[PDB]
Design a protein around this nucleic acid. Sequence first.
RNA 1: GAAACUGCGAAUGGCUCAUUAAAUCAGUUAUGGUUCCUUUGGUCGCUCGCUCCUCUCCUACUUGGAUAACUGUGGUAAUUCUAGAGCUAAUACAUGCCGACGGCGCUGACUCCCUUUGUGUGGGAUGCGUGCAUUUAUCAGAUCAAAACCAACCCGGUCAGCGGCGGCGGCUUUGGUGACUCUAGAUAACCUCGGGCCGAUCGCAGCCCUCCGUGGCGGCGACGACCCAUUCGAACGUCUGCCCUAUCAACUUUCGAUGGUAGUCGCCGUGCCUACCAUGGUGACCACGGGUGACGGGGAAUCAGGGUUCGAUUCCGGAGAGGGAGCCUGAGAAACGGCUACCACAUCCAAGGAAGGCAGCAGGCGCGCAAAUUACCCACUCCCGACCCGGGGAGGUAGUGACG
RNA 2: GUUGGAUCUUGAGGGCCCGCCCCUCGGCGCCCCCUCGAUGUGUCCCGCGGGGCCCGAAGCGUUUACUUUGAAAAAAUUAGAGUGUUCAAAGCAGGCCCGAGCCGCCUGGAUACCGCAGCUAGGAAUAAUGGAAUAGGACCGCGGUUCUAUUUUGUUGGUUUU
Lengths: 263, 59, 206, 158
Amino acid sequence: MARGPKKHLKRVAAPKHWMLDKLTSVFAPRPSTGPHKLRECLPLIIFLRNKLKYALTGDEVKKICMQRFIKIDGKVRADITYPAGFMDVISIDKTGENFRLIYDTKGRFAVHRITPEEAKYKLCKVRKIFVGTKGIPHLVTHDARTIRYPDPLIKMNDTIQIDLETGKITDFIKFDTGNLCMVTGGANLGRIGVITNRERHPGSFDVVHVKDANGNSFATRLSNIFVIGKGNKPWISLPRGKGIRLTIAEERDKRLAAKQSSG
Amino acid sequence: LVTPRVLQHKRRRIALKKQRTKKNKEEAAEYAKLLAKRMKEAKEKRQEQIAKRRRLSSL
Amino acid sequence: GISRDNWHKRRKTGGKRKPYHKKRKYELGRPAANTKIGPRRIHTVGVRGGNKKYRALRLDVGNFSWGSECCTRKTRIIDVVYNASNNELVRTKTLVKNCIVLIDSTPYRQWYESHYALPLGRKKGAKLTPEEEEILNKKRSKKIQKKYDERKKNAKISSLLEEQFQQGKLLACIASRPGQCGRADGYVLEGKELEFYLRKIKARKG
Amino acid sequence: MADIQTERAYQKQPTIFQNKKRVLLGETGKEKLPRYYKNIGLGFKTPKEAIEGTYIDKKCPFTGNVSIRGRILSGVVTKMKMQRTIVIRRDYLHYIRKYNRFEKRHKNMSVHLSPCFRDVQIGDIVTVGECRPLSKTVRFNVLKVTKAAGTKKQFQKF
RNA sequence: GAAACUGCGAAUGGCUCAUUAAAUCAGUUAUGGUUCCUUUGGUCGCUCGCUCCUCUCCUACUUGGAUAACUGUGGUAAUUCUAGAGCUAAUACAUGCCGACGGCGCUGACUCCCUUUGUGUGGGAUGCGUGCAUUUAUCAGAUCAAAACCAACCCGGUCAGCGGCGGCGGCUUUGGUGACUCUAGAUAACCUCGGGCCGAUCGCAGCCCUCCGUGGCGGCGACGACCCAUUCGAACGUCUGCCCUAUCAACUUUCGAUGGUAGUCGCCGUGCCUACCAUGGUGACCACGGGUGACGGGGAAUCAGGGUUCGAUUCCGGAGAGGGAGCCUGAGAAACGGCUACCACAUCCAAGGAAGGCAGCAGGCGCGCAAAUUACCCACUCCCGACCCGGGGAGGUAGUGACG
RNA sequence: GUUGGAUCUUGAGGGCCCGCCCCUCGGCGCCCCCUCGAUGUGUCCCGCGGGGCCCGAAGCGUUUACUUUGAAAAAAUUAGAGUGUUCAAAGCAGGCCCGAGCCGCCUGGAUACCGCAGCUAGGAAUAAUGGAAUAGGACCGCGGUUCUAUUUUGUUGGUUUU
């Protein structure tokens, strides 16, 4: 048996890149149902008390949430295990600090403060662009936000500045060659780079040849490429650890050099 | 029982409904302008394409 | 209970499969509607995954469409003359999809004569006498000329249709499941298909 | 091709139906109503046989409502026996690392053969494509019957 | 604010590996074959006026009537047993309203003008169809290169028409997928009845009245409802892989074995089931049959390398909860801390009856070569709920502990 | 069942290395369009940006296995990096500066592994595989005959071609 879906998830069976411990706790937070899939999510708790360390109990975490000092995507949340994802902005209204989640090329979720100007909008790639019922068109973004009456020239894999004050499309950026991308998941996790060429194969799975800033060339599936804006025109800054790609030797040299040299 | 709270709630229900109807109208109208203006630059391409097909066929 | 799985029965090799788990609610495979001809009852049923499925017990009206005029009228279905799934279904008068039924001629004919303002011919003596003549005369005083220009090659319709009007019932084919949909709706038989079904009706009898 | 009045029920294709209009008699088609054909993509073209057809098969992906998605496999026809099905033997390599040679293995698979393929025989190389289960054994459908060298009757003088 | 009704959890959790040999399961693929509460994002006035019953269908300043808890009387040897009387709520239950003063097609009483009429331009009260969903039917879903003439008739340069048209030209209008009769549009209806939907709900507070209590409106959040996407999934489908056995060599359907066709049925594909019709399907490349302390994987132990051996057992998937069979609730269960029957077991009995399932945590009996507290706690870690607040043998904590 | 003979072509630059020999793109070119310089619905340098056709190049000729590069490829385990658990089994930590207003600074939790099969891509040796024999394949080589689809002569119908 198995008479229905689990409402629990054990630790030491949760995805590595959330940066939880091994067996020292027997249960992981587990994301709630929401706009993103649970593998790629980062439960609010892990950000709040394991990275920003504002709680040393679970009792505190609930009490923090009930204050409602936390908006996520401009809207007022109170969920203890909110399923935030890629380019989801967290807005602390008590301190005026806006943090966004973007991958390190190490593969660890970055604590990446952004200005409240850049926390007005986020760039969301279209997943489907849908001729809906009664001939009204809609675009649907990756984060499951359906915006009606969208711009009437858009096509698949375009990005779309969604605004979080007022909802809706606030222009768009057209998908073209050489656009900035962050390649997410896989062995190419958290790398940034242009395009170069998108190879098309009829039937399932189309691969996109990416060249990164360093000049290392690799392919991944189209699914694993996320378009984050226009070529050589960032809209949010690079995170820690380069965010490009760095070798284990170089990384060791940074780790030893910076440590016992601060303070 | 109808009481002042109940009346106020009844006015909130209709108000929201009224707000929602007018919202749909505005979005549709604004969208129509965008779609219509685009025509003049975008869709007029078609004349050029039909015409050139005859130049090409000549030789 | 009543069952529906792939983890039973014989293999390709001539082997025999041995069970995967014990019967579960999903496998349920409810007994037949067994809807026939008689006064309409339909029941709403709760089915798996939520949603509502209609179980018809007795039907006697359907919505039958005249596919060459693009109009559908609600008519009586009085009997099953032919069914190609099983002969027994006809005899028992059980309504299933693809039953060849008998519907009234009169509403389709009445619609056509009124609408096109000219009669197809004469169906019957009884039919003619109070109206049909009325239609022919027209209620247009004035706009008589408009009807004549508008309707060319009318005062008639196709040969197969006219022949069925004479009978006083039209053959029609059920295009929906009467037990799951709860609708015994269908399209009127026409051209080649009608000819073939009459051949089957004649072949089987005698 | 083969008539659909051979059985005991007349059939139609979706949204192909008789309008007989005002004019007397038919349709009453002269090919049993317009034969609709459509492509299936993935480097296959609908042949003459689909267009010529009027058959009661609907497990054909050029006249049916079946969709071909997934793996495309090839096999050799080991048996043709009864109508509308063939058996293909699919040779594959099973890799053994433990011994430093490895062994061929095969399976026989019953596969539907549409009447959109005729003038076919045993020994023919055939290209099948994945589909939803059509019948209990048959998951697949013949998309193209290839002829192909190594088979000959290609040295000719007629 | 005890209680009780309402809504949700109770399918999860925990436990154990008996069962099963391409079955389970792993990896790789699919759903264009289908269902999905919730969350997150859109979708929230209308009958487009029955050519306004919806200005009369005038209950909108809001309709109808019953159960608990409660109160009282009680029955039963024994029951988480339960009767009857007297009340009486709703975000429970069944209804139904205020509203387009500027909806929409042909039939059409017809009426106006120019070639009488004929023929053509026009616009029209009287009717009926004008939200979506369901079900049916048809159309639609434009999509590729040039000429000379003739028949119909748009304009422009002329006039052999006389731009009423004959002689020369001319602008020439649809969303996706590799791929669907896909999406979307047009027409004609259909009904679901107690038995599609479109709010008769509440809590916080802030308004204004050609003016005084009414009717209108702005913010915050609660819950319900409809539709689509989403998330957690589910059920089936691809490919490739498993132990020993020939003192198991032919096997599969008369109670379908394989296939065609059509239907019943199912959340949905499918011999799933059934009619009719074919005679298939599979094997020496080990099928078929038999055996199995045979759950599967990630993983574990030893080996120069090659290999050999292990995997119930801290995590993931599947499976079962004494054995069988059936079922209810719910989006999800064929559920033993749900139910119902039988069968094997056990219990109470006043003999009429009645209630039950430690392969949950401790503990006991039996078994054995073999394995611990009838303890303490929700503070941690997380889960559930109407919720920070509560509950947790999940889980933490100690005790037992020369596995190591 | 296993195993199997022989036999087919690819000179420069710098002190090996590189491309070659016995049409969806890019583009030598030819023709088209906004045109790029002779020019400013538009040429004669050109397809350069979108085209068509079509060479060095390239699907080229007929298939592969193999091998090679990518992706997809649970965490724990495990190898193993960073880390001073007093050593260590292990754990994923930590280390500094400031009197305690420095209302503080900062490094991490690498990387590696995937029975197979499948997916992508480079190679063409090896092992199989490819064809023209009473002729066949190439290049609009061309004709007489017949058909059907749609562009176009405004639109729509008929006839006749292309």
